[PDB]
Scaffold this active site. Structure first.
Site, PDB file in Angstrom:
ATOM      1  CG  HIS A   1      -0.212   0.044   2.527  1.00  0.00           C
ATOM      2  ND1 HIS A   1       0.199  -1.096   3.183  1.00  0.00           N
ATOM      3  CD2 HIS A   1       0.167   1.085   3.302  1.00  0.00           C
ATOM      4  CE1 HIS A   1       0.803  -0.756   4.310  1.00  0.00           C
ATOM      5  NE2 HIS A   1       0.798   0.560   4.406  1.00  0.00           N
TER       6      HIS A   1
ATOM      7  CB  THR B   1       0.684   5.389   4.106  1.00  0.00           C
ATOM      8  OG1 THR B   1       0.677   4.008   4.485  1.00  0.00           O
ATOM      9  CG2 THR B   1      -0.028   6.206   5.178  1.00  0.00           C
TER      10      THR B   1
ATOM     11  CG  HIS C   1       7.136   5.338   0.611  1.00  0.00           C
ATOM     12  ND1 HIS C   1       6.890   6.450   1.385  1.00  0.00           N
ATOM     13  CD2 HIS C   1       7.053   4.274   1.442  1.00  0.00           C
ATOM     14  CE1 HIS C   1       6.673   6.075   2.633  1.00  0.00           C
ATOM     15  NE2 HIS C   1       6.765   4.759   2.694  1.00  0.00           N
TER      16      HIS C   1
ATOM     17  CB  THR D   1       7.172   0.044   3.061  1.00  0.00           C
ATOM     18  OG1 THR D   1       7.298   1.409   3.480  1.00  0.00           O
ATOM     19  CG2 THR D   1       8.176  -0.811   3.830  1.00  0.00           C
TER      20      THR D   1
END
Ligand SMILES: [Cl-]
Ligand SMILES: [Cl-]
Length: 213
Positions: free
Chosen positions: A69, A71, A148, A150
């Protein structure tokens, strides 16, 4: 009264998540086996490890459990600063549950995190919060630069670090490439920082929504 999500963001479909995840693992494997990376271990690693091969898949041994995902605003159910202010935005309520395409332009690695750089559209930028602790603006970078996904973290690293690592990497590039992987050219930014610029940008499908613990 009504408490908020744990976090808002774009959650990739299982299929887009599997794709990006598998690509991430390939990158870690390829980078760790690359000549340039092996000859620079001393800047990536700290102390006492002998100089044989480091397996980055082991190193980044904390991966996101669910789907990958991107965020937007960590809210902690309203316990985070600016949570209420972000949630009440018209555009967030409008976009809630809707589908988006996230463009991935690069994959990076530092001694703390491994991630993928997201290049947000003007539309998606409306969903980026304006009051993050260390925003791009207090750093001379376009808003949303730290967007971004992760892919992995070191043992004692929190996933928030990934965004910070990207911001730092994007300051450095504001140098000739030291290698070439099947998907792009590899750059060495020093201090164990590495970036793979994709020759063709990955596009992943995601749903903008709120996650609860
Ligand atoms: Cl997955
Ligand atoms: Cl939709």
């Amino acid at each position: 009264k009504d408490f908020l999500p744990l976090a808002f963001g774009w959650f990739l479909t299982k299929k887009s998540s599997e794709t990006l995840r598998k690509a991430g693992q390939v990158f870690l494997e390829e980078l760790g086996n690359h000549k340039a990376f092996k000859k620079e271990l001393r800047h990536f690693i700290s102390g006492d490890e002998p100089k044989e091969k480091l397996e980055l898949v082991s190193y980044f041994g904390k991966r996101p459990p669910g789907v990958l995902h991107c965020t937007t605003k960590f809210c902690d159910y309203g316990k985070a600063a600016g949570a209420e202010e972000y949630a009440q935005q018209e555009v967030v309520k409008r976009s809630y549950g809707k589908a988006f395409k996230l463009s991935i332009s690069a994959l990076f690695v530092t001694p703390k995190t491994a991630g993928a750089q997201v290049v947000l559209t003007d539309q998606e930028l409306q969903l980026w919060p304006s009051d993050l602790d260390k925003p791009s603006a207090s750093e001379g970078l376009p808003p949303g630069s730290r967007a971004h996904v992760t892919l992995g973290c070191a043992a004692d690293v929190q996933p928030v670090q990934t965004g910070l690592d990207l911001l730092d990497i994007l300051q450095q590039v504001k140098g000739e490439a030291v290698g070439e992987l099947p998907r792009g050219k590899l750059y060495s930014l020093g201090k164990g920082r590495w970036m793979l610029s994709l020759t063709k940008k990955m596009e992943v499908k995601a749903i903008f929504t709120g996650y609860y613990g």
